[PDB]
């Protein structure tokens, strides 16, 4: 019964094609609820879930002003990073940010996050203490020194322990019917001969929320990790997720195989087998 709020920022430079684009999205758990895009005609924080639509104009206006200022800060950051790495002004680069809080069922803080990546590689992160930083390299050590002098960590701690938790609790209350509802997977097993000798068994999970799920195949009760093809969990587009796991089995041996499904929304985990009809 824990929950997370996260903001995910992406800034991408594009020399010769204007200033770097800034995109923000906000999530509660696996539910997106806001966006901002500096390439929109009229950039503004916009709702992306129904339960946020009730926030008043002051919410939307203040958050829009924050994201515009963040875009400007990230553009300064991008220029500084290019210099810290002795990079050409000709190339494109990416700065990503992620931050937010985890709470338990009691609404108490479990942990906070505030971290960054440059060109897809971890750059600097606020430690779990919400007081100190981990820098990846000598460039990030520059940022660390600057952020220590500016007492950035103190301000991030204050947001993570205060605003972040308080607004996450508000959103959970207002979005309760969805955000606090687990939808269990609908499951089945399919069978497809591949040759006279072997067949694929595919165990499906559809329609579930949240995304976290475990699908495993066992042969005689032993997990078949090396022999299971497991696709990434994927969004359906209706808030729910899908996943399958497949194994290739000797023809005639299908009853030795069981698919095991674990998910929040289930009263108990499922054991499934191919049911020939």
């Amino acid at each position: 019964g824990s929950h997370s709020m996260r903001y995910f920022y992406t800034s991408v430079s594009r020399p010769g094609r204007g200033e770097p684009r800034f995109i923000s999205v906000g999530y509660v758990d696996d539910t997106q609820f806001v966006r901002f895009d500096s390439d929109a005609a009229s950039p503004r924080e916009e709702p992306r879930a129904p339960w946020i639509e009730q926030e008043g104009p002051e919410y939307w206006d203040r958050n829009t002003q924050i994201y515009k200022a963040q875009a400007q800060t990230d553009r300064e950051s991008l220029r500084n990073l290019r210099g810290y790495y002795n990079q050409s002004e000709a190339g494109s680069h990416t700065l990503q940010s992620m931050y937010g809080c985890d709470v338990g069922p009691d609404g108490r803080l479990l942990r906070g996050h505030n971290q960054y990546a440059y060109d897809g590689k971890d750059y600097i992160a606020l430690n779990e203490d919400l007081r100190s930083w981990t820098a990846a390299d000598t460039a990030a050590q520059i940022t660390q020194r600057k952020w220590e002098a500016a007492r950035v960590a103190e301000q991030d701690r204050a947001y993570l322990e205060g605003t972040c938790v308080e607004w996450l609790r508000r959103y959970l209350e207002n979005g309760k019917d969805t955000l606090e509802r687990a939808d269990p997977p609908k499951t089945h097993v399919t069978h497809h001969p591949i040759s006279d000798h072997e067949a694929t068994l595919r165990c499906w999970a559809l329609g579930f929320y949240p995304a976290e799920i475990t699908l495993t195949w066992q042969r005689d009760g032993e997990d078949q990790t090396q022999d299971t093809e497991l696709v990434e969990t994927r969004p359906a587009g209706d808030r729910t997720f899908q996943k399958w796991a497949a194994v290739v089995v000797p023809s005639g041996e299908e009853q030795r195989y069981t698919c095991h499904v674990q998910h929040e929304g289930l009263p108990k985990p499922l054991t499934l087998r191919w049911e020939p009809s």
Binding site: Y59, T73, S77, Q155, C164, W167
Partner: peptide
């Protein structure tokens, strides 16, 4: 709701 920006890198 988002955090305010603080200092560039």
């Amino acid at each position: 709701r988002p955090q305010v920006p603080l200092r560039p890198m």
